[PDB]
Subunit: 333 residues, 4 copies
């Protein structure tokens, strides 16, 4: 009569998951931002866990769990989990990779166009009371807005979202390059894209750089004081991937010195983001959104339902064989 | 030794046009907002005129010119000129129809995505100090953001910009309908679009309505208290065409009552626009830009050079035969 | 109790049209190839006429009709009718312009690919008993097959079919140019195409030329001994438009001398076509189809139903106001 | 002063490879169709081997080599090599996966259109002397030609060529489904395609089935007497992948009984192909090409140069680390 315990770590709403797990697991929530806020009962008895991106699990955090057997990220990115240590400790880790692909690609294109077209900045100027009566004043307030056709969009990471961005970018006349050192040769041919071998080549030829790679152990601060200097003078930077990929120190100085004309960021090294704190406090030509590229009403539901099914498959079946999106089978023993 | 006089009515900068007209016409500027601000010398002696969109010419205004023989709009729209009366008075009217086509289509897609993705509103909330730490808070602050695929984009006016928008919209998964009662049947087939016969059908099936038609004598307040009721509950409205097409009274009430979830406007019934005056003073979910959809550094130059060449062709050749983009040959006698 | 007479000139099957015209007109057929084969009753009493492309009507032919008031081409092209003389004689002429647009564009792409890929010629070689065992033999039998990406496709006439071809050609990596001296500037921008001003420029830069213009009084033998010399050495020629546009004499010599590597023709100066007669008797690298680019089971029905409705509208309403696709309103008096 | 020996097994021309291997290896050719035709010197001393698709290497064949250390397929498919046994024997196997991707996709679209549009069959009828004078005769000779828009194209194997086909098929109005049980979920979203879970679903919903998967140990005769019955009545079949995927027995009967309206085959169970032998001797509505989907003058050179470089990398460096496209690293010991 005793069911396994499943805990929603960094959240409180479990409404979507309940119908799928009702007869399978007892569902509790922690609404926690760190391991220090998880009730002892959870650490001891929790067999499964659901979590988003607002809490990190190190080996130290993972070792506090005594019965945990699966973690499911409600989302694609799993950089916030020590995946290797989870496998060493016998904990399967899964993600939801497909739900918000096109939502994120559309958010990225929105930011790209918001830089080339300055719509968001033009709206601000009107909210601030700027009066734009003459054509000379239109040119002035819209200074920086550039023609898109002929421009080169450089994609770092041509996975699910990267490919979706590439196909959308082609519709506007962008010349699309991409850098992805983990794919085999020939993917550029199917999608009619141009490929480059190094990060330096990508930054050197791109008028607008957009990040679409996972954050792994080999690309933290991929955009740093060194690689920022490899970018075109007056280029754009867009990041809907992970904030850990950009050295905000180097980015702030680049915006201030005009080496980078503008930047649009949905993610940041330290989240939540605030224009009153951080290395970007006074950075100009900066657009930001609070890690919302993924969100739609349908997507939010679809990924929670998928994550709930993965939990069910783990409790009901054999780990890791019954799992559809386990991302650490190699490390699991 | 006496050259014809050409006047830039509603502007002052003539730098781009001078190299093309130096040996052909004397160039002066008026920097005028109305006919009342034009120097008497211009009204009497001006043979040609260059003007943007910030000044209107009625028959009353046109009759004040005693030597004018051609007007060239530096831009595509010529609704601000009494075209028929200009032809009656023997004045050719020309425009520049091709320069800013893709700039405007990209601005339109930016506004479309800014509504579906709420990037501009999410940026404001961060500037306003909103703190978005939990996923529940992300869902809250981004409430209204919707998935694009499957949504129906309704285009009113499938000309140069409309077709450019249609092709871009298809890349995001939009289902594209269009209404244009002046085209012959078969244009929908070449571009693979669906066509509807009436404005009511367009508004009835569209989740997002975008205007791309010229303002003529048969579509002022095309979007009015009556036709607004024919739109889907919670639909979007985008207008980069002409402000005279929308009854801002009806639009304000629709936004306030939630019948329309959001609106993005680059043009307005009375320009320049201000959030502190007009029927849209307190309208919610409203994005606005100061008639800047056309602008790029290249476009601004290209259209001024084309307009200068048209002037030259008129002074040097025979009106209207030597004109490339005369829009009132039928009325000219 | 007496109904008007409507005659299907160059056909016999009236099954599709009968349900639409039953209570409106008496329907007869002539199954005629020339005016000389039309029964006297038809010439005297026929008020309306339906015809395809296999019969020509000169002023001499038109003058033989004493009551005819409308002609409806079951199809888009109306070059086979003296349109001006028909208007002088008070005869409205209409067409069906939209039905087979995409069928024809798909046929054109089939011919284009059949030249670049030599599928049809490779099939023939297998039917002829050629044995292709080694790679060296594959290269030999497929000699001439070329990579498409980077190649330039030159479109002459960017109307309904031309635009449909252009959009399909872009999917294969073609660089698309077009020549159309009757369109206004700016259509190239909406569809992202490159435009040229003269026929010579089109032929000079194109690796594959495809015709998509109507046959009018200013382009008979548009491809002639002179303009053929303006084409690239080893270029392709495709014609799904009208045979009168090509001088088959010049074309045969070009194929024989290798100036043109191959040609695909759905239409010919004299139809029906036969490989045993005509200037193309012994021309090599020649593909031909019997004027079938338009045909699909749905298209054949759709255009006959549309043509029947046009007839009905003419008999029931006022000519030319009630007509949807009258192509000679200017000449009608 | 003694260099390693490299042999071109099933070919004779080594001109392209010589400049790359001149100072690295002695190059000989065998022009062999089977292992029985290879000179004893080659079997004993050959360190590297180059081969196309016209010779098969079993474990029995592989065991005859006493010094062979790498095989390089000049092409993508390596089904003609016992890959596992090659690894057991310490032989690295490599391929050239990217060269002819778009050539093959264009050949596939040519065959697809040749079925829907019957261009190749219409050309034959003209070569055979068929006279097509009336529209009724055009409909007759072109019977079977169908409208493409709305039709469903089912892709089996969405790799390099499959994705290239999918993007081209979308330009014609196809609804594209694909079946590929080896990809992870989410690839359909990036390319905007619909995905199905089983082969039966693919065949059940597809009007035209096109094969684009490698031939492996789990899909020989994937199209068989059983799965052919799961296809739509009157559907099309296209195969530019491998002939071993189709049971030509079942295919012949399907074409004869009309269950399949037509088939286009670039590959066959037994190659070379002949219309006078095999289960397809008398099959109707059959188009065939002699395994030429890959060929272009540029592609033929590019893959031979890549294959030569792979050989060089193997002789010069460390196997398998220095290899770019080794397809049997797992089996190599
Ligand atoms: N709201 C948001 O901000 C959202 C963010 N994301 C993030 O976007 C990123 C991409 O997601 P997906 O495309 O679904 O992942 P994916 O796994 O489909 O694609 C990742 C690609 O990046 C490439 N890559 C990895 N390291 C690289 C490097 N150093 N340089 C170049 N390429 C590299 C990989 O080869 C792979 O192809 C993820 O980090 C994910 O967390 C995803 C959805 C929403
Ligand atoms: N910065 C800005 O806000 C810019 C605004 N525009 C405006 O956008 C509009 C479109 O420009 P283009 O596409 O270049 O013009 P266009 O002449 O190429 O296309 C206009 C189309 O609208 C159609 N139309 C007219 N009245 C209509 C009605 N009542 N209902 C439906 N369709 C109707 C016409 O048939 C025509 O096809 C113009 O009014 C122009 O002034 C253009 C460029 C920049
Ligand atoms: N089975 C077949 O072979 C079929 C043939 N056709 C033919 O294809 C042709 C095109 O049809 P649509 O695109 O529907 O006609 P359309 O009227 O939509 O387009 C014709 C275009 O050709 C252009 N043009 C005319 N003369 C020209 C010249 N000398 N140089 C360059 N451009 C020129 C016009 O400006 C116009 O834009 C027609 O002649 C039609 O008869 C159409 C359908 C089926
Ligand atoms: N001249 C010719 O006929 C040419 C033939 N080919 C052939 O085309 C085929 C595809 O080549 P690429 O796309 O480059 O290979 P690829 O490795 O890029 O793609 C193969 C795809 O097929 C899928 N697949 C394998 N077995 C399957 C099954 N039973 N059901 C559904 N999907 C399955 C795999 O998951 C993979 O995604 C190969 O067999 C190759 O030999 C390639 C080039 C020229
Ligand atoms: Cl995320
Ligand atoms: Cl480059
Ligand atoms: Cl404007
Ligand atoms: Cl509908
Ligand atoms: Cl026709
Ligand atoms: Cl050029
Ligand atoms: Cl192959
Ligand atoms: Cl389905």
């Amino acid at each position: 009569s005793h069911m396994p315990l499943v805990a929603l770590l960094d959240g409180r709403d479990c409404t979507v998951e309940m119908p799928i797990l009702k007869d399978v697991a007892t569902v509790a929530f922690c609404d926690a931002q760190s391991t220090q806020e998880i009730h002892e009962k959870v650490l001891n008895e929790a067999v499964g866990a659901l979590m988003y991106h607002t809490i990190t699990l190190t080996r130290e955090d993972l070792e506090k769990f005594k019965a945990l057997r699966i973690i499911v990220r409600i989302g694609s990115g799993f950089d916030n989990i020590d995946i290797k240590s989870a496998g060493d400790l016998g904990i399967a880790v899964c993600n939801v990779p497909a739900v918000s692909v096109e939502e994120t690609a559309d958010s990225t294109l929105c930011h790209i166009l918001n830089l080339y077209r300055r719509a968001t900045w033009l709206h601000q100027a009107l909210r601030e009371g700027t009066r734009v009566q003459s054509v000379e004043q239109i040119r002035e307030v819209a200074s920086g807005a550039a023609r898109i056709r002929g421009e080169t969009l450089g994609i770092i990471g041509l996975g699910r979202v990267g490919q979706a961005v590439a196909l959308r970018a082609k519709a506007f006349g962008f010349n699309v390059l991409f850098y992805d050192p983990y794919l085999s040769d020939g993917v550029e041919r199917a999608l009619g894209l141009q490929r480059v071998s190094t990060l330096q080549d990508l930054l050197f030829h791109s008028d607008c750089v957009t990040l679409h790679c996972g954050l792994n152990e080999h690309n933290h601060h991929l955009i740093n004081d060194f690689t920022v200097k490899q970018m075109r003078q007056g280029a754009f930077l867009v990041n809907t991937a992970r904030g850990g990929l950009v050295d905000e120190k180097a980015l702030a100085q680049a915006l201030k010195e005009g080496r980078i004309r503008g930047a649009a960021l949905d993610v940041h090294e330290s989240e939540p983001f605030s224009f009153s704190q951080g290395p970007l406090k006074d950075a100009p030509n900066l657009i930001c959104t609070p890690h919302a590229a993924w969100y739609s009403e349908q997507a939010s539901i679809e990924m929670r339902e998928e994550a709930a099914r993965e939990i069910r498959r783990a409790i009901t079946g054999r780990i890791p064989d019954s799992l559809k999106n386990c991302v650490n089978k190699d490390h699991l023993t």
